[PDB]
Amino acid sequence: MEVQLVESGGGLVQAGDSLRLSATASGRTFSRAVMGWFRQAPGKEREFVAAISAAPGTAYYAFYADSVRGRFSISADSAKNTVYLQMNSLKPEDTAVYYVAADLKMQVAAYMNQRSVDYWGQGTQVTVSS
Amino acid sequence: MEVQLVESGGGLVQAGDSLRLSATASGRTFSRAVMGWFRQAPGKEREFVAAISAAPGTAYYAFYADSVRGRFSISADSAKNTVYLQMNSLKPEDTAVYYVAADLKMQVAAYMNQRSVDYWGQGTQVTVSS
Numbered sequence A, B: 001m002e003v004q005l006v007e008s009g010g011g012l013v014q015a016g017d018s019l020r021l022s023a024t025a026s027g028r029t030f031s032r033a034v035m036g037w038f039r040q041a042p043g044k045e046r047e048f049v050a051a052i053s054a055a056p057g058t059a060y061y062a063f064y065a066d067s068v069r070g071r072f073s074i075s076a077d078s079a080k081n082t083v084y085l086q087m088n089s090l091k092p093e094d095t096a097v098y099y100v101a102a103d104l105k106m107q108v109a110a111y112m113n114q115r116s117v118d119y120w121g122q123g124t125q126v127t128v129s130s
Helices: A027-032 B027-032
Strands: A005-008 A011-014 A019-025 A034-040 A047-054 A060-064 A072-077 A082-087 A096-103 A124-129 B005-008 B011-014 B019-025 B034-040 B047-052 B062-064 B072-077 B082-087 B096-103 B124-129
Touching: A005 A096, A019 A027, A019 A034, A019 A096, A019 A124, A034 A082, A047 A072, A047 A082, A060 A072, B005 B096, B019 B027, B019 B034, B019 B096, B019 B124, B034 B072, B047 B072, B047 B082, B062 B072, B082 B096
Parallel strands: A011 A124, B011 B124
Antiparallel strands: A005 A019, A019 A082, A034 A047, A034 A096, A047 A060, A072 A082, A096 A124, B005 B019, B019 B082, B034 B047, B034 B096, B047 B062, B072 B082, B096 B124
């Protein structure tokens, strides 16, 4: 089986800055799953960040965790089987390994429990210094 | 919630060589979950390597993927809440990011479906040189 999920982006930024993550999924996984982002801060379990689900036509439904609401924007492009996370007004508290996630059972973007995730990316470090 | 699983060890070895990896689990997960190891080779999805029965102290079952049978061995140290993956007679085809995993819905070592895994480690690169 070929790798389902591959993240790109990540790196070192300063407080206030923006950084974009993206991830590709195989066509089958992309079309069959609610796609999401998680983050694992130092010493902590991976926590839900945002999710996005396809709706009829060009439509998408998006759902964000309270901690990142407003500051982050999630999006997807089915022509490229890619999901994007644009992070803005980044703070030290946002420092983490960020993971893309796919849940094949969910149909509509909602809070995703990490324990229910079917496929994960390899993780990508984002560091925000004061 | 604290991180549940943390790998240690890894690197580059030569074909024919050996390497043991370790991972710490929280007290709760060590007691309650089947723990195991997966690996993700470049461009391939993560595949099952080995599993050990929940709460492995005095006695446990161990179970292995056919590809690593006899060469690989899994074990534990209950006193340090640690699981080990011993890899003998390493081959270039064993090159991968290796991940520890735990499944709270399993009690006896067995094939672990990546889709059912509750908690994941961060992964560690193991390269086997030709």
